[PDB]
Amino acid sequence: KSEVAHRFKDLGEENFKALVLIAFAQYLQQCPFEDHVKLVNEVTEFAKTCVADESAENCDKSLHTLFGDKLCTCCAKQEPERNECFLQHKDDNPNLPRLVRPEVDVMCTAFHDNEETFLKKYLYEIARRHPYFYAPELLFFAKRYKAAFTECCQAADKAACLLPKLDELRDEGKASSAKQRLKCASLQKFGERAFKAWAVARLSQRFPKAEFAEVSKLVTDLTKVHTECCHGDLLECADDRADLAKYICENQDSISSKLKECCEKPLLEKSHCIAEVENDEMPADLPSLAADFVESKDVCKNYAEAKDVFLGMFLYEYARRHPDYSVVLLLRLAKTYETTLEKCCAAADPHECYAKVFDEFKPLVEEPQNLIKQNCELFEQLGEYKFQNALLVRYTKKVPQVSTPTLVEVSRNLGKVGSKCCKHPEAKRMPCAEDYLSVVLNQLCVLHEKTPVSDRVTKCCTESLVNRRPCFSALEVDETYVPKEFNAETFTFHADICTLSEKERQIKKQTALVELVKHKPKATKEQLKAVMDDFAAFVEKCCKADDKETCFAEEGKKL
Template identity: 35%
Template sequence: MKQLELTSFVLFLFFLTESLPLPTKPQDADDFSVVQKFIEENVEYITTIVFAQYIQEVAFEELQVMINNMVEYRDKCVADRTLPECSKSANEIFQEKTCSMEGLPQKYNFSHCCNKVDFERRLCFFYNKKGDGEFQSPFPTLEPEEKCQAYQNVRKPYLHSYVYEVARRNPFVFAPTLLTVAANFEEVAKACCEEQDKATCFRAKAAPITRYLKASSSYQKTLCGAYMKFGPKILKSINVAVFSQKFPKVEFKELLSLIEEISSMYDGCCEGDAVQCIRDSAKVMNHICSKQDSISTKIKDCCGKKMLERAECIFRLNRDDKPKDLSAREPKFTDSKNACQERDINPDNFFAEFTYEYSRRHQDLSIPEILRISQVYEDLLGNCCNTENPQDCYSHAEEKFNETTEKSLKIVKQECDSFQNLGKEDLKYHLLIRMTKKVPQLSTEELVFLGKEMVTVLTTCCTQSEEFACVDNLADLVLGEFCGINKNRTINPAVDHCCLTNPAFRRHCFESLEADKTYVPPPTSRDLFIFHTDLCQAPNEELQKKKDRFLVNLVKLKPGFADQELRSLFLTFTAAVEKCCKAQEPEACFNEEVISFLFH
């Protein structure tokens, strides 16, 4: 797995594949009517996404009623766009029709949203979404032969069903991303259903789709979580940093114009307004391609491609090299005697320009680190501009920047040293113990998931040349997903504080957390530590999961034990599993071996 390029996800790969009806001429993508036509032709898929994301428990049969309602609305407005209801936004119409479905609001507990109007109602639907971990219904699976038979016999309902199942489990993923996933899945189904070994084909070809969905979901939730909790300023800072690193030759004024369009896109996309999200993303792509000469010479070929190809082409491009005449630092911010006066004229643009200048000069730094430096500079000026000699005060800014970066580098070095010294499996156990002590209130499943995610980050990044940026970027995504998007989680005071901290310093905050001293272990439950013969027949992956769960439950039971003691108990357990699986009566052996060393 290669390092994830944050720039590849800023617009979240808003490209759609061949199986959806898209314009074929590059210039057509600039025409609003073409985007509108695409929306009208895909209204059934878009309705499926929105309905399944807002009301995740809804039955597929009830979804069909909503699809019919929205198709009827589309046909009516296509015939006569002057009708009063056709002037409303698609999201408004969708929510009105959802609320008018007899008994549905009461059945799925969203009637309180239907009593609200306009922004309040939209926000209510958003906050009503359940996070991924709260929606526990298992994803329905079919054998490859059944899957192909269903696809070939009833293609459209089968694809609707697939979109419905993916969307309800990924309530915060943007509609264009889910349309891409569905289209790619159809391409996989077409190819694999022609193969003799369908199972192997599906496994191989579906894996990249799953990775794409997971990466997009993680980034979108992190960015939207920052936007919903901290407002547009942090969103603007992130986008300035990302695009300045990606396109360091672009002029600041041009960058600001692009960032304004990108930032406004998030209103609809983060809220779940699928139609507006599709329109705004197309508008952003048109902006980039209409200004290609001033943004980057590398995107010219991409902008000559079809709409479905050009966004992917642009965001897969490597970063532009820094301009050769770019100085090591911009003196305007640390050497000029007028920094305070320039700040006061337009603070937002002044600090955005600082972020732009620092990002394009430091392409080796992570996005969170750029944001840390920017916040340090803003705080520094806040202090210095109130002194008798501001210039003397902020002339030492570089020292402050270096201190901040050194602290971040130290965290990553310690993490990568652990990876190098412990190896993948021992690193996972080390992280599970640390994380469980810090947030023992989390479910066992979520702690195991977080441990796995962090191991993936370190194994992905710690062997790369850009080790620091890779670890810091991806670890920040894990924390962003953990802290949530549509509500503030209440876990324990220390963790809650970190989730409400400026996102730039979230990593530092979590790193400094100690074990939660307020945690009271649950009453001793032997049920958590009872094992059966099936443990011995479990595939290796499932066996590893059971071991991970055991370790987390062990730490929850004995949080006061030192890490080494917990590790010793865990090794005793793994030895017991090996011994008992060779015994004539494994269950009796488990009871004797495991229960004895845990509870006596």
């Protein structure tokens, strides 16, 4: 009967003060650093007064209420509502200056000058920019960031040690945020049942030797964890993730053989290790599948008694045999099998109706395998940057109304699928690619939601989680779109481009390629290549020869 006390005891002052800064940083975002800290110590000192006396002032309150009231300095509502208004307040792309990394001697100075203030401002500036970041995982990022600054500042060549370690984390963190933004969308827009099915098919692939009732218990506990994190109960998220990692390590025998390494590591390292663990060996003894889920007579009787748990047993069995199948594809086969039983179960002789069910699976498996083969071959012919430019032109044509910054980054990460999944074996390609495209297309979804402009994106995002990749892969070139007017200001770069990195220049060039398609969408790959060769050469012509910084200015209108 002391939630704030119960958690402090389960989590410790340091993890408490951190989770609360992520909880505050994610819910307010525009509020400054020091202001957030004020409120964090204010709660942590009050939490200790509730640890000292569980019947002291305001110690009977719930975390939502207590943290909600402290957030109120939206609001104007009660807990059932107040939190949701705040959850819908979260900016997926706030106007915050992209944080500039200062010098390595500068950063190592400040780290020494105040370790706590350095690592807290890291948690703040990240969590404000990623308001749906998995909180127990951002703490693991913070421990590793500390470890990079504690090691590499004592090193002779500090920047040779520090800069790689940081870039690794930044890349891992972008991937961790995006991955879990999809987890939140699934819960907040399509419900827990959807998440549960997703979680059944993922964990069954991860632990094929585990029996259905064991997986079901993990799926229940993992849904609890991710629900709470996505709903802003960060403290309760942290406890149950830790609680889940313990149960798995105590019952590995009944779960996976691949847990021996992860169960040696400590608390933050352990949770992160299991979340990302290689799939266990598929068992030797497995049925015909069809023999029990169509060739039986009492399949409608079982489905009628409870729908969600027969569908669970199907998904678990289907998934455990197919780790080479993407989780999204496995969910589609499960949706198909669900819509087919609703119709055939009452219809005359059900058995004679549901026999063609395995025939409906065949096209659904082919669809992703064809696009993945097609686009991995394109990536061999082009390479990351050029392959990105192919997808940049493609999606600007498909949905031109979308903002130019969104089009660039989304198609950048869409192209990143090439490096990540095409070098993989032809078997691992499908789960790698499809499930990654789920993540990158969900970014287009959550970024577009802010100021809607292309109703085609609106349409594909709202219809279904599972059929978003094929929905966007179905969209043809929008010929209804009214072409953009030529703007000389956008197609003329400044001298600032020479002081920026290779990647930053690529983004800027790729930004111009989106505008170039928006002015004339009828332009072919041949036409756009001639203007791409034109823009790439003139920047190397001006930047390399810094004589006449007005070199860029000499460029007016070529069409």
